[PDB]
Amino acid sequence: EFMAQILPIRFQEHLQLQNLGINPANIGFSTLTMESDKFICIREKVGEQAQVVIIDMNDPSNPIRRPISADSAIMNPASKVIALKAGKTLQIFNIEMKSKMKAHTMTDDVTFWKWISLNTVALVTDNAVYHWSMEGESQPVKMFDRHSSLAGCQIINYRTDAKQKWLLLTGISAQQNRVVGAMQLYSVDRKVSQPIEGHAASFAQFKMEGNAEESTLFCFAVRGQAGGKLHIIEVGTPPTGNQPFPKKAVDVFFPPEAQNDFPVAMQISEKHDVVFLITKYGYIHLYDLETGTCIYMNRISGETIFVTAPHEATAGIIGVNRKGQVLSVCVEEENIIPYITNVLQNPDLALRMAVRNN
């Protein structure tokens, strides 16, 4: 209780989507996308008519709404560009210039897709993953074939390292009354896949003390038969001159009343070298990227948070919950080291954080 009033985080509510004319039935994974902190896109069928709604997070009181039919709609992370699909037909549309950009017809249905950069869409079929540039004439390019361990899964995420050399596909399945995560880590250079049991993950770049060059880290969290675990590992050849990053493995805690909770989302602060982990029940956890030390845990949402993105300005995490609350969490930069000193009583981490300068 000493200094218990000083949190290491700042929680913020940004929006309530039901106050912006969004039907609650459409606030969910199949109909609402948030590919970055810049936009939220919702598909709604008002009467017999399919509509696409775009909320510009910089102008949220003026949603853009159009009678456009699509099975899925994802805004570009940065520009006023949208990808739409209808069956096997994909199109990318330049909203700003009110013009079509690119189109492609697949032979296999796309069951999941996501923007992975300012200019590339990843496409997941039942049997493969493709990357499609929004520029130029190029067709999607196959990156890898799907591993059998993901067969029949609901795909929930796809993401890459910054250099697009380490690719990660995540799915879940219902095995009796358990939700089991299955990941496929693919190395572009080695042309090798590794199946991993995991629920949520991210990549990060991290410059170790004593090294001149960044390490590419892969962090994943799982709740399996052994309970909750978080792993932080370097992937790929360490830059010449670097020492290797020692792999970290730490517990992920669930209270006794939360036996059916599990990880659903992860984002990593570039600036603060902190991992944000969100659970199905609406808990957030913070871990130190370097050591895996658990900094903080709390239940921040009464409803499941079903989509997240980096929150750029604060190097935090932003998300939408099933009632339509748009919320974020970030490090509170002036309070985190007091909290580490006096509540965690971890002066090694207090020092290491100040030395990084944060």
Ligand X SMILES: O=C1N=C(NS(=O)(=O)c2ccc3ccccc3c2)S/C1=C\c1ccccc1Oc1ccccc1
Applying CB under 6 A, the residues found at the interface with ligand X are 52, 54, 64, 66, 68, 82, 84, 93, 95, 98, 100
Q: How far apart are CA 95 and CA 323, in angstroms?
A: 28
Nearer to ligand X, 53 or 315 (CB): 53
Nearer to ligand X, 100 or 190 (CB): 100
Nearer to ligand X, 75 or 221 (CB): 75
Q: In angstroms, give the least distance from the CB of 192 to ligand X.
A: 38
Q: Report whether 358 contacts 295 (CB < 8 A).
A: no
Q: In angstroms, give the least distance from the CB of 55 to ligand X.
A: 12
Q: In angstroms, give the least distance from the CB of 70 to ligand X.
A: 7
- From residue 211, alpha-carbon distances to 17, 52, 157, 239 in Å are 45, 48, 32, 9
Nearer to ligand X, 66 or 190 (CB): 66
Closest CB to ligand X: residue number:
98
Q: In angstroms, give the least distance from the CB of 82 to ligand X.
A: 5
Q: In angstroms, give the least distance from the CB of 236 to ligand X.
A: 37
Nearer to ligand X, 68 or 128 (CB): 68
